[PDB]
């Protein structure tokens, strides 16, 4: 496909899931070859794995003393829409969580795409690779299309669930919300996270029950959201990705580990 930016500036705002603070975004058009980058307090922070500074419960980026928390959801939306050149100006410390899914970003950006004049240079997985960490694993292999499978094993009524995204089915994952388990809430707050989480932006589950009165959007909403997360972390390769991925219980740390191994393989090709 063609490289793409946005036609006009787009703004979003609201509380961040981990800081609990209100922040504002402005998405700016950029010319061919710019890449995806954040901008904060006069500093550009490229959306690339070299700038990852935190991977526990979110993926955070930083450069020259300026940090942005929770980039995975906006990056996933930009990856799915193959937006390749854009500056995300952040006034605040975190990307807004909005309703917990990518939907509001996706719908607004999708109607505001500007095609540009050169083709995308995709990051094309060239050979199989496996990374592992204490029973979690992620595999990748070549594919002409982006295909991403997540398999989870939940310690509550959800049990084992599996979901596969393929190109063309973007609407199946951009509405899946972030989620949390009630028995983990106290620890997440103690380690300084989750300050913005509420039933308005998080699917909260117990051992046997659903806290949200509206219930789940899909019976497998959590693994759909985990696929959505992984697609955002994969965009830290710096280009839209072609390959077939399978994650068993992976999280941001393992996602970024895979990204860094893939980037090392193609550093000069
Ligand atoms: C899903 C992830 O873990 C992923 F990493 F796997 C991760 N999400 C996260 O890491 C993550 C972590 C925590 C929260 C939260 C919360 C919260 C929600 C409501 C209340 C309110 N109470 C609920 C009970 O009744 C009384 C009221 C408290 C706290 C959300 C999200 C991801 O999406 N990263 O991109
Ligand atoms: Cl490769
Ligand atoms: Zn997420």
Numbering used by the authors: 2 to 270
Please quote the authors directly.
Here, we describe our discovery and characterization of a biphenylacetylene-based inhibitor of LpxC, an essential enzyme in the biosynthesis of the lipid A component of the outer membrane of Gram-negative bacteria. Twenty years ago, the results of a study by Onishi and coworkers suggested that inhibition of LpxC, an essential cytoplasmic enzyme in the biosynthesis of lipid A in Gram-negative bacteria, was a promising strategy for countering Gram-negative bacterial infections. In view of LpxC’s key role in the biosynthesis of lipid A required for integrity of the outer membrane, the testing of LpxC inhibitors has revealed potent in vitro antibiotic activity against a broad spectrum of Gram-negative bacilli—including those harboring mobile carbapenemase-encoding resistance genes. The compound LPC-069 has no known adverse effects in mice and is effective in vitro against a broad panel of Gram-negative clinical isolates, including several multiresistant and extremely drug-resistant strains involved in nosocomial infections.
In order to visualize the mode of binding of LPC-069 to LpxC and to compare it with that of the previously studied inhibitor LPC-058 (14), we determined LPC-069’s crystal structure in a complex with Aquifex aeolicus LpxC, which is used as a model of Y. pestis LpxC. In the inhibitor-bound structure, LPC-069’s curved tail group occupies LpxC’s L-shaped hydrophobic substrate passage, and the terminal morpholine group adopts a chair conformation. Interestingly, the crystal structure featured two different head group conformations for LPC-069. In the major conformational state, the Cβ-substituted methyl group of the head group interacts with a conserved phenylalanine (F180) on LpxC, the hydroxyl group points toward the solvent, and the difluoromethyl moiety interacts with the conserved, catalytically important lysine (K227) and histidine (H253) residues in the active site. This type of interaction is consistent with that reported for LPC-058 (14). In the minor conformational state, however, the presence of a phosphate molecule in the active site causes LPC-069’s head group to undergo an ~120° rotation around its Cα-Cβ axis and thus distance itself from the protein’s residues. Given the very high phosphate concentration (~1.25 M) in the crystallization buffer, the minor conformation is probably a cocrystallization artifact rather than a bona fide binding mode. Compared with the major conformational state (in gray), the presence of a phosphate molecule in the minor conformational state (i) pushed the difluoromethyl group away from its energetically favorable position, (ii) caused an ~120° rotation around the head group’s Cα-Cβ bond, and (iii) disrupted the electrostatic interactions between the fluorine atoms and K227/H253.
